[PDB]
């Protein structure tokens, strides 16, 4: 047989032993190391500005709605000056401590839909929510004064 063959030629046993003896031995990296011990900034600045722009804030869970129903809700909210927002908890949890909102930590988890405004049409918004028996109002904080749902109802009335 030729030195070059289509198949892998059988090595002389001495050559095979040489290869086995000179096989690569990886180092042991000591104790097992595993077992051992600009849209983001755009959102940052936008939310920083929004926290001052808004005077009254609220939040809901507008995820159970359809595309068309959500569009209609947005239209009814834009009839007024209120604006509906959403932003990651991933970046909002830092925002609460950034803006000094300690009581707001256990309010934003999951889908959260902010309702930033300066003029309360919450009476009519709650009336609209009434004919859709779901999507309950969630607590908010107007001008650094935390309001529960009962607070929002009293403020509306």
């Amino acid at each position: 047989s030729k030195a070059v063959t289509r198949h892998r030629r059988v090595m002389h046993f001495q050559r095979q032993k040489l290869m086995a003896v000179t096989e690569y031995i990886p180092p042991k990296p000591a104790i097992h190391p595993s077992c051992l011990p600009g849209l983001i900034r755009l959102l940052r600045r936008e939310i920083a500005a929004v926290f001052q722009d808004n005077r009254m804030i609220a939040v809901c869970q507008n995820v159970a709605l359809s595309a068309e129903d959500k569009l209609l809700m947005r239209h009814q909210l834009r009839k007024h000056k209120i604006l509906m927002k959403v932003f990651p908890n991933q970046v909002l949890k830092p925002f609460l401590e950034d803006s000094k909102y300690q009581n707001l930590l256990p309010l934003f988890v999951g889908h959260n839909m902010l309702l930033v405004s300066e003029e309360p049409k919450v009476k009519e918004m709650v009336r609209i929510l009434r004919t859709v028996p779901f999507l309950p109002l969630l607590g908010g904080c107007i001008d650094d004064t935390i309001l529960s749902r009962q607070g929002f109802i009293n403020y509306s009335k």
Binding site: V4, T5, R8, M11, Q14, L18, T22, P27
Partner: protein, 205 residues
């Protein structure tokens, strides 16, 4: 011309004189076209072999069909079939001289780049069909980017430097330690035990 150029079966002017089957042109590391040239991806030959015109057609058709002509361009990094393989008749008793030319073929050594791609496109976009073509190829082949090529090379030096085995094929062969040169080839002193016939053992330091 952002397309892979057609390769002829045989040279227009053939070789009147038959030449011997110098398998050394397949044996050992490739010294030519081992580096990227005006491209980002390519097919690396992890072993030696002979590229027939059928392989050339397979490569050309597959790549031309499965690349974007405007963005992706391709270039052959291997000459056209130029070595005649004088395959004899379809049955005859041995002797009578040497055979006649029936096919033409281009040798390829390990570490040789076969086809080189380029243009505005990232590696994973091309990995699929380059890997299919590599598998189609007659020798071990691999779809390799510039980054992956440099990464595997640097890994090879890392292995060569960090192995805890006191005994390396280079040391033993060069020093003729156990009289192993009675079993090795003179080419083994330079192949360093990483090449056996036309096969290349990348895993082996």
């Amino acid at each position: 011309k952002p397309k892979l150029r057609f390769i002829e079966r045989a040279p227009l002017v053939p070789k009147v004189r038959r030449e011997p089957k110098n398998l050394s042109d397949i044996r050992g590391p490739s010294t030519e076209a081992t580096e990227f040239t005006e491209g980002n991806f390519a097919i690396l030959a992890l072993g030696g072999g002979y590229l027939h015109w059928g392989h050339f057609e397979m490569m050309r058709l597959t790549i031309n069909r499965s690349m974007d002509p405007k963005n992706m361009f391709a270039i052959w990094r291997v000459p056209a079939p130029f070595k005649p393989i004088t395959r004899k008749s379809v049955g005859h008793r041995m002797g009578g001289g040497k055979g006649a030319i029936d096919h033409y073929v281009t040798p390829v050594k390990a570490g040789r780049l076969v086809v080189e791609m380029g243009g505005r496109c990232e590696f994973e976009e091309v990995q699929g069909f380059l890997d299919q073509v590599a598998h189609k190829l007659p020798f071990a082949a691999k779809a390799v980017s510039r980054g992956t090529l440099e990464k595997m090379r640097k890994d090879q030096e890392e292995r060569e430097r960090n192995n805890q085995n006191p005994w390396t094929f280079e040391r033993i062969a060069t020093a003729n330690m156990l009289g192993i040169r009675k079993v090795l080839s003179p080419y083994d002193l330079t192949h360093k035990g990483k090449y056996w016939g036309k096969f290349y053992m990348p895993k082996r330091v």
